[PDB]
Write a protein that binds this ligand. Structure first.
Ligand SMILES: OC[C@@H]1O[C@H](O[C@@H]2[C@@H](O)[C@H](O[C@@H]3CO[C@@H](O[C@@H]4CO[C@@H](O[C@@H]5CO[C@@H](O)[C@H](O)[C@H]5O[C@@H]5OC[C@@H](O)[C@H](O)[C@H]5O)[C@H](O)[C@H]4O[C@H]4O[C@@H](CO)[C@H](O)[C@H]4O)[C@H](O[C@H]4O[C@@H](CO)[C@H](O)[C@H]4O)[C@H]3O[C@@H]3OC[C@@H](O)[C@H](O)[C@H]3O)OC[C@H]2O)[C@H](O)[C@H]1O
Ligand code: CA
Length: 894
């Protein structure tokens, strides 16, 4: 956010500078559009970076017609550039023209509004009053910037200022060939993924989020770089994530430095990056370079996450959902070329049936082909963000994958999916323990290879604390895991890694599932053609207290006897056609809508494996058992592999368990973690033992546990009080021979690292350790300085005791170039020194920079780094001649 008068003068100062660059034969290193080309940032070969505005801020007042604002431009005459005002020469006293390039100043004509409310223009001592200013929308003096060929870059104006071409810098570094062909980082049951968010809402230092993830988890992790689509509804402009490209770039470099996988620019229609309609645009269109760039330069980049694609379409500043699907059609090809994933996540309401994962492939036949053909690259995820329809949306998201249109299936859980005011069981606020249930249920019984989140990131995963002292009198920003992150999430993944929780393959799920619905309906409302049959789940796994479809407010199943029921558009391949029972929805209203008849046919397909009010589903020798109701709840489960007779289970509310049957052993992973520290009680009884059993228990993470044992009349009874997760082992043998046989250890394969990133590293000043600085801007959007990288910058300031430090890295020993992007608006700063590894190496030339709020500059140093960690400091020695600002540093090999 900024005033119209700032915007105008910025463009003028830019026009002066472009002309200066032209006659000094300077080159454009980089340019990039923002807010769909409302503004651009521009870097030249001398390191000068500045904004130009294609849209000007409204003029405070309220009026909203287009009205007059002065237009300072430039024409050429007798070989020379002179200032224009509204397409006539700019003159003051006499009729003397005024050169752009005058041998004394770098003062441009300044436009203003005086105190009688008239526009004015001043140039040194001279000054000129023009027309009355008037509240209204204004038009910019500048149109846009495009590229000509691969040589030229053109700046075009809206007045009669000529076009201005500058050469497009070519860098003499040999470009690094990208990764193509096969998938960069395969995902499968053997190689699952956790998407952990570096979140614009946490105002992250990516480096410190990465480090909060332990080593055993890291290799299975895919860091998800979240750009918030929070914006000003009137203008369109993004705040939280002001410069999305620049955040993504900065954090994607840190990821690439740390050799970890990474991928998120949209929520609903809103997106920091412009949608395409043709595959050609990925190379030919200077409005959409970001797509190719991330794949080309970062070998750890897996692609793009379009989350929550159910809202915000057809906005003034979004796109239609059709246009989005179309963008996916092209983007998916791009993704396939580079071995990437495109991820989509859906949560549902009544208004959004026509944009769900059925409609996705049923409404757009071209996307359907491109999806089918590159399913390996396409990942479809259930989101738990909306207030209803969870079983419908679970079926459909699962159906996408099994039917062959997506390669992997995932869950993105959210607190926000707890029912509002009343909640569930008598618990107003969402309790974290609840979250473990859907996830384990859908991972173990429906083949999810991707866990995403959980949300909200900043309530469930990480928070920033106050700054902390880190030696030598320096202080740093700091981040911490929430306890439920460690005690639910981290530990649940350890239980996948350690092969307790075996993820079934697609073909394994179809054999279990048995049945599919095909959505072959073309008549009726949006719900009739894209959503599942309304009473699909009734008298199956849907609770008594809950209701059908959009009155389905609870995601806990009443029973696990019947498997999650998938709903697809079509079956694309051999395997999808191996479904035992294919039911067309058109027949559904006739036959299956009678709840009793459905339950009758389903009962023949899916035998009773237990009784009681707990949730119990079995796959191979693994049970998921949980309690999603109030009060102690029970079940009687006859064993299928263990040689004892049966187990009777009695569990507290929101206790979840994973129970592995062995001929002479049982394991329980149990959890029910409350951060406030309460205990819960659980009771396990084994029947049919022909021997005194024994038991073993280990607490996990920050959990507690005590277990009591009771042998009596051939019943063995374990009483497990605990807070948080634990593994319990029961050695119990019986005398049965009618029992199945346990297959050998499922595979878990530790996912390979990405190739080593050979490009430049970046370290944002707002993440530096610091002492005695004037101001540290971690949330820049609300402050006066524009055109910065990531979310912020700092004002180092003039203190003689001012200093900063970060830890930087180097693939090996040698000379590197350190580019400090900075601002020195009032005076040159010759008074700050640089230390590498606690040895002073020079005094960067921080030349006076232009006063304008968008201008930054870059100061260079050559230095020796050694292989691995290096320490970087900037230290004042005296009082600065003026404020020094710092946005970042960028390190590259010479
Ligand atoms: O960048 C942050 C980023 O966000 C992600 O994480 C979460 C998000 O998951 C989520 O985002 C919110 C999603 O829900 C929006 O609310 C829904 C909007 O549409 C409403 O439907 C209309 C009802 O009336 C009808 O007549 C009308 O026709 C319907 O709309 C049309 O429906 C079909 C569409 O195809 C069509 O385009 C649309 O126009 C719907 O009822 C409403 O319901 C929501 O309420 C909750 C209930 O649990 C659910 O979110 C959903 O059911 C929501 O936007 C709302 O907030 C304001 C707008 O700012 C309005 O009230 C409404 O539009 C999204 O909110 C915004 O997300 C971005 C964030 O930066 C904003 O601050 C936030 O307001 O929840 C929040 C977010 O944390 C990423 O992981 C995270 O990094
Ligand atoms: Ca910065």
């Amino acid at each position: 956010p900024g005033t119209a008068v700032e915007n105008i003068n910025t463009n003028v100062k830019a026009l002066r500078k472009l002309i200066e660059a032209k006659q000094q034969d300077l080159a454009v290193k980089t340019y990039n559009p923002v807010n769909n080309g409302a503004s651009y940032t521009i870097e030249l070969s001398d390191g000068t970076s500045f904004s130009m505005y294609a849209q000007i801020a409204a003029l405070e007042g309220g009026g909203e017609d287009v009205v007059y604002s002065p237009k300072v431009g430039a024409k050429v005459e007798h070989d020379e550039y002179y200032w224009t005002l509204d397409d006539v020469w700019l003159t003051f006293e006499n009729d003397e023209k005024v050169k752009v390039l005058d041998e004394n100043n770098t003062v441009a004509p300044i436009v203003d509004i005086n105190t009688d409310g008239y526009w004015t223009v001043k140039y040194g001592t001279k000054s000129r009053t023009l027309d009355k200013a008037v509240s209204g929308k204004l038009t910019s003096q500048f149109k846009q910037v495009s590229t000509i060929g691969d040589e030229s870059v053109s700046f075009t104006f809206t007045d009669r200022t000529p076009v201005i071409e500058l050469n497009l810098f070519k860098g003499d570094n040999p470009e690094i060939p990208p990764v193509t062909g096969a998938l960069r980082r395969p995902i499968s049951p053997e190689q699952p993924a956790w998407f952990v968010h570096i979140d614009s809402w946490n105002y992250a230092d990516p480096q410190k989020i990465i480090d909060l993830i332990p080593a055993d988890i890291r290799p299975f992790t895919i860091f998800n770089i979240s750009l918030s689509v929070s914006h000003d509804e009137a203008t369109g402009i993004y705040n939280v994530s002001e410069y999305g490209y620049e955040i993504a770039k900065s954090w994607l470099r840190t990821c690439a430095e740390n050799n970890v996988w990474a991928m998120q620019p949209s929520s609903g229609g809103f997106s920091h990056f412009k949608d395409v309609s043709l595959y050609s645009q990925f190379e030919s269109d200077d409005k959409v370079r970001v797509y190719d760039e991330f794949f080309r330069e970062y070998p750890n980049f897996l692609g793009f996450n379009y989350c929550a694609q159910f809202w915000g379409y057809d906005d003034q500043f979004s796109v239609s959902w059709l246009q989005r699907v179309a963008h996916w059609n092209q983007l998916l090809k791009l993704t396939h070329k580079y071995g990437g994933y495109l991820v989509v996540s859906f949560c549902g309401n009544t208004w959004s049936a026509n944009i769900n994962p059925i409609a996705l492939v049923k409404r757009n036949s071209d996307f359907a082909q491109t999806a089918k053909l590159y399913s390996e690259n396409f990942i479809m995820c259930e989101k738990y963000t909306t207030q209803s329809g969870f079983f419908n949306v679970e079926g459909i998201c699962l159906g996408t994958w099994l039917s062959g249109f997506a390669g992997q299936y995932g869950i993105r859980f959210d607190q926000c999916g707890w029912t509002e005011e009343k909640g569930q069981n008598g618990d107003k606020d969402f309790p974290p323990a609840a979250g473990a249930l859907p996830i384990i249920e859908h991972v173990m019984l429906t083949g999810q290879t991707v866990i995403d989140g959980p949300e909200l990131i900043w309530q469930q995963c990480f928070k920033e604390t106050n700054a902390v002292s880190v030696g030598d009198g320096y202080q740093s920003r700091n981040w911490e895991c929430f306890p439920q992150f460690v005690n639910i999430n981290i530990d649940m993944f350890r239980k996948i890694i350690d092969k307790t929780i075996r993820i079934p393959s697609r073909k394994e799920v179809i054999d279990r599932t048995k049945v599919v619905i095909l959505q072959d309906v073309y008549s009726g409302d949006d719900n009739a053609k894209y959503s599942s049959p309304k009473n699909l789940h009734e008298g199956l796994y849907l609770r008594d207290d809950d209701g059908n479809l959009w009155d389905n407010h609870c995601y806990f199943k009443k029973t696990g006897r019947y498997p999650t029921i998938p709903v697809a558009f079509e079956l694309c391949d051999d395997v999808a056609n191996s479904f035992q029972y294919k039911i067309n929805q058109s027949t559904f209203e006739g036959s299956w809508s009678d709840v009793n008849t459905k339950v009758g046919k389903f009962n023949r397909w899916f035998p009773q494996e237990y009784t009681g009010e707990l949730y119990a589903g079995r796959i191979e020798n693994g049970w998921v058992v949980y309690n999603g109701l109030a009060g102690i709840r029970n079940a009687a489960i006859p064993f299928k592999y263990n040689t004892c007779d049966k187990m009777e289970l009695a569990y507290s509310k929101y206790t979840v368990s994973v129970i592995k049957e062995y001929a002479n052993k049982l394991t329980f992973y149990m959890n029910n973690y409350d951060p406030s520290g309460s205990s819960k009680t659980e009771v396990i009884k084994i029947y049919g033992c022909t021997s005194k059993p024994t038991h073993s228990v280990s607490s996990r993470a920050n959990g507690t546990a005590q277990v009591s044992e009771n042998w009596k009349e051939d019943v063995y009874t374990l009483t497990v009080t605990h807070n948080g997760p634990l593994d319990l082992t029961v050695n119990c043998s019986g005398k049965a021979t009618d029992r199945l046989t346990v297959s050998t250890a499922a595979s878990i394969q530790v996912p390979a690292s990405p190739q080593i990133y050979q490009g430049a590293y970046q370290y944002e000043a707002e993440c530096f350790d610091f002492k005695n600085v004037t101001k540290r801007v971690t949330k820049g959007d609300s402050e006066p300085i524009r055109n910065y990288t990531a979310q912020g910058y700092i004002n180092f300031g003039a203190s003689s005791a001012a200093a900063v430090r970060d830890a930087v890295t180097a693939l090996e020993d040698g000379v590197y170039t350190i580019r400090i992007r900075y601002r020195a608006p009032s005076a040159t700063v010759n008074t700050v020194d640089m230390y590498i590894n606690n040895t002073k190496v020079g005094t960067p030339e921080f030349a006076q920079t232009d006063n304008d709020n968008t201008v930054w500059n870059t100061a260079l140093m050559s230095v020796s780094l050694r292989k691995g960690a290096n320490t970087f400091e900037l230290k004042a020695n005296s009082s600065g001649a003026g404020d020094l600002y710092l946005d970042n540093i960028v390190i590259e090999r010479k």
